[PDB]
Structures are given as C-alpha cells and as structure tokens.
Design a protein around this ligand. Structure first.
Ligand SMILES: Nc1ncnc2c1ncn2[C@@H]1O[C@H](COP(=O)(O)OP(=O)(O)OP(=O)(O)OP(=O)(O)OP(=O)(O)OC[C@H]2O[C@@H](n3cnc4c(N)ncnc43)[C@H](O)[C@@H]2O)[C@@H](O)[C@H]1O
Length: 189
C-alpha cells in the first residue's frame, strides 16, 4: 500500500470533500476512503465500539487517532490489489494523525486542500441537515465541528505546506468549477 499514490483530501465540514472525491473516482479510478464513512459503518454494525463512536460523532468531536487510523489502514489493505491510488478523505484532521499515518503506512504525494468559507459550510450543512437528517448536522453540532476544524485541522494544512505538497482548491465555485481545479492538480502529478 506504500507503493500507490496517496492523496490526502482535507477541508472543513461541508467544504465539498466527499463530492470532489467521488468525481475523482469516476474519472481517475482512484480508491475513495472516507474516515467518516468508515466510522459510520462501525456505528451501524451494532458494536459497543460503534455506540462509543456514535456518541462522539453526534457531539461533533474527534474520534481517537488509534481507532480511525486502524480503520483507514484496514480499508487500504482490503483494497490493496485493485488500487493504483488512494483518496484519504477527512484524514488527517490533526498534525499527530498525519505523523502517525506516515510512520505506519507511508507519506502522501499530494494534499488537496478543499477550501470553503465558514458561512458557506454552515449553509451547506444546514441544508443537508434538513434533507438527509444526519444527526451531527443539527445547528449546535455544526458550530462545534467548525470550531474544531479551525483549531485542530488547519495546522495540518500548515504541516503539509512545509512538506510542500498542499494544493489549494477553491471550493466556493460551482461543483464542476471546483473539479477542474482538482483535475488540474491531479494531472500535474
Ligand atoms: N480523521 C478523523 N479523525 C477524527 N475524527 C474523525 C475523523 N473523520 C471523521 N471523524 C468524525 O466523523 C465525523 C464526520 O466526519 P466526516 O464524514 O468526514 O464529515 P465532515 O468532515 O464533517 O464533512 P461532510 O461529509 O459533512 O461534508 P463534505 O466536506 O464531505 O462535503 P460534501 O461533499 O459531503 O457536501 C456538503 C454539502 O454541500 C454540497 N456541496 C458540495 N460542494 C458544493 C459546491 N461547490 N457548491 C454547492 N454545494 C456543494 C453538497 O452537495 C452537500 O450537500 C467528524 O465530525 C468526526 O467526529
């Protein structure tokens, strides 16, 4: 799995990470791994761990590194012989997550920084909340997730800027405008 291209996709809640990753999959055939999807899947399994994860996620807090990195590595290994590239969506969310990923799996080739305005993100999450009804899309939890992104996850961007692999994606544009930037960054690999 250290063999393949590893792309980190990092951005605030509702910035458009998942949407852009799925466009990348259809055009490039990369493997999309969502830390969020992996966790929600554990929740719906009925496990005690899933119940613990559910409580944390509904509060808009960070799940512990050990759990989420376990599941990321698990998933990378399961898809290992069909993937010539990974999109790690929503990991890392703190500097220590990036470091432990590198120590235990491998270094990323690229970090796509999905950059949206705070209000735009609130709007989108408020709108999805009224539609899908994800438990963490209620108004107060949105604010907790947003404030947490700013505190814990923005330093991840600084870290990988020092590495030199961050490409900033203007995610305020229409979805297809955003994807043109994403495509441009991926082609220049
Ligand atoms: N590494 C980790 N470490 C510790 N804990 C972790 C963790 N990862 C997860 N967790 C825990 O799990 C929880 C959820 O994590 P996670 O599942 O990763 O959710 P999230 O980070 O909050 O992001 P979202 O899925 O809500 O939105 P998105 O950024 O992917 O945008 P999307 O494409 O869906 O679209 C958003 C909406 O806007 C729309 N939209 C997208 N792009 C545009 C656009 N250009 N224009 C207009 N609308 C757009 C979309 O259609 C959609 O309706 C976390 O809060 C945490 O508790």
């Amino acid at each position: 799995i250290k063999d393949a291209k590893i792309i980190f996709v990092v951005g605030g809640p509702g910035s458009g990470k998942g949407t852009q990753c799925e466009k990348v999959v259809a055009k490039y055939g990369y493997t999309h791994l969502s830390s969020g999807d992996l966790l929600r899947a554990e929740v719906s399994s009925g496990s005690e761990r899933g119940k613990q994860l559910q409580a944390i996620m509904q509060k808009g807090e960070l799940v512990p590194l050990d759990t989420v990195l376990d599941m990321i590595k698990d998933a990378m290994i399961a898809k290992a012989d069909v993937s010539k590239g990974y999109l790690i969506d929503g990991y890392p969310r703190e500097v220590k997550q990036g470091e432990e990923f590198e120590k235990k799996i491998g270094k990323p080739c690229l970090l796509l920084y999905i950059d949206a305005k705070g209000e735009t993100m609130v709007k989108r999450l408020m709108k999805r909340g009224e539609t899908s009804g994800r438990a963490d899309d209620n108004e107060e939890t949105i604010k907790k997730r947003l404030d947490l992104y700013y505190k814990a996850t923005e330093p991840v961007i600084a870290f990988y800027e020092g590495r030199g692999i961050v490409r900033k994606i203007d995610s305020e544009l229409p979805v297809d405008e955003v994807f043109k930037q994403v495509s441009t960054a991926i082609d220049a690999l």
